[PDB]
Design a protein around this ligand. Structure first.
Ligand SMILES: *[C@@H]1O[C@H](CO[C@@H]2O[C@@H](C)[C@@H](O)[C@@H](O)[C@@H]2O)[C@@H](O[C@@H]2O[C@H](CO)[C@@H](O)[C@H](O)[C@H]2NC(C)=O)[C@H](O)[C@H]1NC(C)=O
Ligand SMILES: *[C@@H]1O[C@H](CO)[C@@H](O[C@@H]2O[C@H](CO)[C@@H](O)[C@H](O)[C@H]2NC(C)=O)[C@H](O)[C@H]1NC(C)=O
Ligand SMILES: *[C@@H]1O[C@H](CO[C@@H]2O[C@@H](C)[C@@H](O)[C@@H](O)[C@@H]2O)[C@@H](O)[C@H](O)[C@H]1NC(C)=O
Ligand SMILES: *[C@@H]1O[C@H](CO)[C@@H](O)[C@H](O)[C@H]1NC(C)=O
Ligand SMILES: *[C@@H]1O[C@H](CO)[C@@H](O)[C@H](O)[C@H]1NC(C)=O
Ligand SMILES: *[C@@H]1O[C@H](CO)[C@@H](O)[C@H](O)[C@H]1NC(C)=O
Ligand SMILES: [Ca+2]
Length: 862
């Protein structure tokens, strides 16, 4: 009865520095999106507007609103103004009184406005340019430089992002633009109360190996209205666990924290939470009721999920060092997923509908893990709710990435609030399986990426320990010991800590995790890849589809090396690197029409990307059970990257807008729970079996060769004594290449293709796989394919019946910007006739699909 809360989200005003511009502005919102919405600017993502609209990011904008409170001041002891998120630096004026300032995008702010609030009020947030602010802070830091000061020229970005607590990629990245905007990016509320006010509540389900029982630690902080002592009770209730518990509490200005420990009666069984493909995502409804002196009731509901996570760094026989793998509820689980980056330059456009769609694509790719990479944001509430409900594990970076950071007291003060706020906000989600202090900054110092003078290295080392160990780690462990903490990615884990927090070689495959990139060598040669304990990053670049590019480009831009394309490419020499890897096994597009060449080159970079990451992922998949030359037991593959922040060449499998690249289709296939993977070593074709299943599985391995001439198997080897143990990888086939060809007369490396598959239940997804005996640019007898398609509707799905004149590799179906994705794409089409489905994301029609449809195969490019 003594509490009142309502949102100030809605229609505000926004105005620029000198007041010339003034327009309506939605909150939550950003200046750029307000200007675009009001028709005052073009789409910022159009062509070169990241350069043309620089002035927006450099001015100082003010968000203003006038409102009439819906309550009587004289009836309330205290009134507060609460911000869930402000981006980033702003002075806050309430009725022309400065009530506070902000400097951190990732922390909530609370301001007492009891003495300044009136019946009619004016609220102004006077933002400061993030770019200008970051530069001034860099200047003030005279005692020494903090690198990197400016980004590479090919990123077309802004300097000194490490000096502002804001999304570190907002000043540009090697796949993202520089639109460092200003805005109120989360909800704003007025909250009045008597007696007490719940500042925050956090909880943590833990398992006591001692008691063999489940508990829930709860912590709540209150702001008490007066100097008197508030009493009351608290009842925590979980009905579906026959659990209920009531305790006495008392609150005072200097004793404002409540701590409870609810024990779950062992009489009842507690179903645990599991990642997708390894169990149920079951949780339990919970309520927390505060009944305080004077009729004040404060209830909070939450969903409780019970699961245990262990980072196991144990010894391995014959493999020097330590393992690095995750046990969920005691079961070792191979991490399968990708790295998540911000889905937009402006967070107000990452709607619930976009997110749910993106998580459907993550699910349909047979992923169970996402890394929230530390150059993005601490993600919005619904991200982690979706992870919990769908069973996606989260590798959670803190928002520090590929940079050194100051330890000036004001900055550290800012960081402490942020980390404290976010850990309390996030620690109750079962999806989060590990805390990670930063991205790649242990490497940056160990290798001296920024070429610091070895005379000043000690300064930066101490700054590193100060930030990630003495502040971030200390805060995390003081809140949460249910999860492992690493200081950086990649790291050597316990070995890094032993070595003083900056390892001698953080890229060691004998400890911790690694990131691995390589653009020079043949991606088909799996020997280039490290047989590491866990691969948290690895990627190849490709261009997004023409449909995605068309929306932010014009006719004259549609060439691989046009001014526009080189502008969007933010990775040093990425266009050449991508072609270099294409040439490795494919013919470059030869054609007369430049637009056709443009589209065909895109297709080939997505072909190169998909096949490269397929080869690389499968290598990690097969290395999970074996040791070879003292290396192995790979227990995770998270490729860089899942998604795009805008239309540009990147490592993503999901183009900006959600459209699947060919990589994503390959991802759905190589992340299956049961998979045969083929490769060669010194002239011997091998086939391992890979299992994520919990029971040993017995199946039948068929192997076949096919001449490019027609889909007739020149042989059919069928071992039916196949057993893959639970969650393991094991060699199931082995033969010389000469012996393999002779047993299939009429086959050359340059004329035949290998194919293999298991025979599965209809309740188990184990797709076809294949292997190429030579570069396709050298394939002989490759008949020119001529594929015919008949489109039809069946319920909410559309059916695509195909027919090919020849064995067509990398058949690619494309319906432009029609929102949706196919049941399968980019596949090797041995058969003559196949059928795939199309899943629309908005209502479409067979006519629309026919008009936009196009099919491509490898031979169409030369
Ligand atoms: C590429 O294919 C089309 C369609 O070929 C048909 O489908 C095949 C699977 C097979 O059933 C063939 O017998 C069919 O012809 C070709 O278009 C056809 O061209 C012929 C003349 O050669 C004509 O009589 C048909 O009416 C056409 N059919 C359609 C649907 O248009 C086409 O010529 C093929 N070749 C090239 C270079 O495009
Ligand atoms: C746990 O709480 C949720 C509500 O948050 C319950 O789900 C609701 O179920 C009703 C009908 O059963 C629906 O009308 C609502 O739309 C649901 N809400 C949501 C948010 O999904 C759920 O049934 C509860 N479980 C138990 C065992 O009580
Ligand atoms: C607003 O108030 C000014 C004096 O108050 C001081 O400045 C403002 C901007 C706040 O920061 C407040 O905390 C300070 O104490 C006046 O100089 C100014 O004329 C006033 N403006 C109007 C329109 O009334
Ligand atoms: C405000 O600054 C802009 C610069 O972007 C300028 O075009 C405009 O004329 C200025 N208006 C006033 C009133 O000074
Ligand atoms: C923005 O504000 C800062 C600090 O108040 C000031 O130094 C800078 O000149 C302002 N920029 C513009 C474009 O008005
Ligand atoms: C998981 O959920 C299924 C429903 O599909 C249920 O029947 C089963 O009992 C659950 N398994 C466990 C181990 O709780
Ligand atoms: Ca390592």
């Amino acid at each position: 009865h003594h509490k009142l809360s309502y949102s100030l989200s809605g229609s505000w005003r926004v105005s620029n520095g000198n007041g010339s511009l003034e327009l309506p502005a939605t909150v939550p919102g950003y200046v750029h999106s307000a200007l675009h919405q009001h028709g005052l600017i073009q789409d910022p993502y159009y062509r070169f507007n990241d350069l043309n609209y620089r002035w927006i990011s450099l001015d100082n904008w003010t968000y203003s609103t006038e409102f009439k409170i819906p309550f009587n001041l004289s009836e309330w002891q205290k009134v507060k103004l609460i911000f869930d998120g402000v981006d980033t630096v702003a002075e806050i004026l309430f009725n022309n009184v400065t009530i506070g300032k902000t400097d951190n995008m990732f922390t909530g702010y609370s301001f007492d406005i009891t003495n300044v609030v009136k019946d009619v009020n004016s609220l102004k947030l006077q933002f400061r340019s993030a770019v200008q602010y970051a530069e001034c802070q860099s200047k003030a830091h005279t005692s020494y430089r903090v690198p990197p000061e400016c980004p590479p020229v090919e990123q077309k970005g802004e300097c000194h992002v490490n000096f502002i607590r804001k999304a570190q990629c907002s000043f540009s990245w090697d796949w993202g633009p520089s639109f460092p905007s200003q805005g109120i990016w989360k909800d704003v509320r007025i909250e009045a109360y008597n007696i007490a006010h719940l500042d925050y509540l956090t909880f943590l389900p833990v398992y006591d190996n001692a008691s063999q029982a489940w508990n829930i630690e709860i912590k709540a902080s209150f702001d008490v209205a007066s100097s008197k002592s508030v009493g009351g009770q608290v009842t925590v209730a979980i009905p579906q666990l026959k659990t209920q518990q009531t305790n006495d509490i008392e609150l005072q200005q200097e004793q404002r924290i409540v701590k409870l420990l609810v024990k779950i009666r062992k009489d009842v069984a507690v179903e645990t939470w599991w990642p997708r493909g390894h169990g149920n995502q079951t949780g339990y409804n919970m309520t927390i009721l505060f009944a305080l002196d004077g009729g004040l009731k404060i209830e909070k509901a939450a969903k409780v999920y019970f699961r245990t996570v262990q980072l196991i760094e144990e010894g391995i026989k014959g493999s020097p060092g330590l393992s690095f793998y995750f046990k969920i509820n005691g079961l070792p689980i191979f991490l399968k997923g990708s790295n998540w980056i911000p889905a937009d330059s402006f967070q107000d456009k990452v709607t619930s509908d976009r997110l749910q769609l993106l998580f459907q694509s993550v699910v349909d790719a047979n992923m169970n893990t996402l890394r929230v990479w530390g150059g993005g944001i601490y993600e919005q509430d619904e991200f982690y709710a979706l992870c919990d409900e769908l069973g996606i594990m989260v590798w959670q970076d803190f928002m520090f990435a590929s940079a050194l950071y100051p330890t000036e007291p004001g900055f550290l003060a800012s960081v402490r609030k942020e980390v404290t706020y976010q850990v309390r906000r996030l620690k109750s989600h079962p999806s989060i399986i590990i805390w990670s202090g930063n991205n790649e900054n242990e490497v940056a110092l160990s290798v001296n990426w920024f070429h610091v003078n070895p005379r000043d290295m000690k300064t930066y080392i101490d700054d590193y320990v100060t930030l990630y160990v003495k502040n971030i780690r200390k805060i995390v462990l003081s809140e949460d010991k249910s999860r492992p903490f690493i200081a950086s990615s990649p790291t050597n884990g316990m070995k890094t800590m032993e070595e003083g927090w900056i390892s001698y070689d953080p890229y060691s495959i004998q400890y911790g995790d690694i990131h691995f990139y390589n653009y020079a060598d043949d991606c088909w040669n799996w020997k280039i890849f490290p047989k590491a304990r866990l691969v948290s990053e690895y990627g190849y670049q490709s261009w997004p589809s023409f449909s995605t590019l068309e929306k932010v480009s014009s006719q004259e831009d549609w060439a691989y090396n046009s001014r526009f394309s080189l502008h969007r490419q933010h990775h040093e020499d990425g266009n050449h690197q991508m072609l270099h890897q294409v040439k490795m096994h494919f013919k470059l597009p030869q054609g007369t029409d430049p637009l056709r060449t443009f589209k065909d080159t895109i297709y080939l970079t997505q072909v190169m990307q998909a096949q490269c990451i397929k080869t690389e992922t499968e290598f990690y998949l097969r290395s999970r059970s074996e040791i070879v030359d003292g290396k192995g037991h790979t227990m995770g593959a998270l490729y860089w990257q899942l998604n795009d922040i805008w239309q540009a060449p990147s490592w993503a499998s999901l183009e900006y807008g959600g459209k699947w690249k060919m990589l994503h289709y390959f991802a759905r296939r190589f992340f299956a729970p049961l998979l045969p993977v083929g490769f060669e070593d010194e002239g011997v074709f091998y086939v391992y079996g890979v299992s994520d299943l919990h029971k040993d599985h017995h199946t039948q391995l068929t192997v076949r060769l096919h001449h490019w001439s027609s889909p007739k198997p020149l042989c059919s080897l069928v071992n039916s004594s196949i057993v893959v143990k639970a969650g393991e990888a094991v060699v199931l086939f082995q033969m010389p290449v000469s012996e393999l060809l002779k047993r299939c007369r009429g086959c050359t490396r340059e004329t035949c293709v290998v194919s293999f598959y298991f025979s599965t239940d209809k309740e188990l997804f184990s797709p076809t796989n294949y292997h190429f005996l030579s570069s396709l640019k050298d394939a002989k007898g490759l008949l020119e394919a001529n594929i015919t398609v008949n489109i039809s509707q069946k319920g909410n799905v559309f059916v695509f019946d195909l027919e090919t004149s020849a064995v067509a590799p990398f058949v690619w179906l494309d319906v432009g910007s029609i929102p949706g994705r196919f049941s399968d794409n980019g596949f090797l089409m041995i058969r003559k006739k196949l059928s795939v489905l199309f899943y629309p994301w908005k209502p479409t029609s067979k006519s629309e699909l026919q008009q936009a449809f196009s099919v491509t195969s490898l031979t169409d490019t030369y």
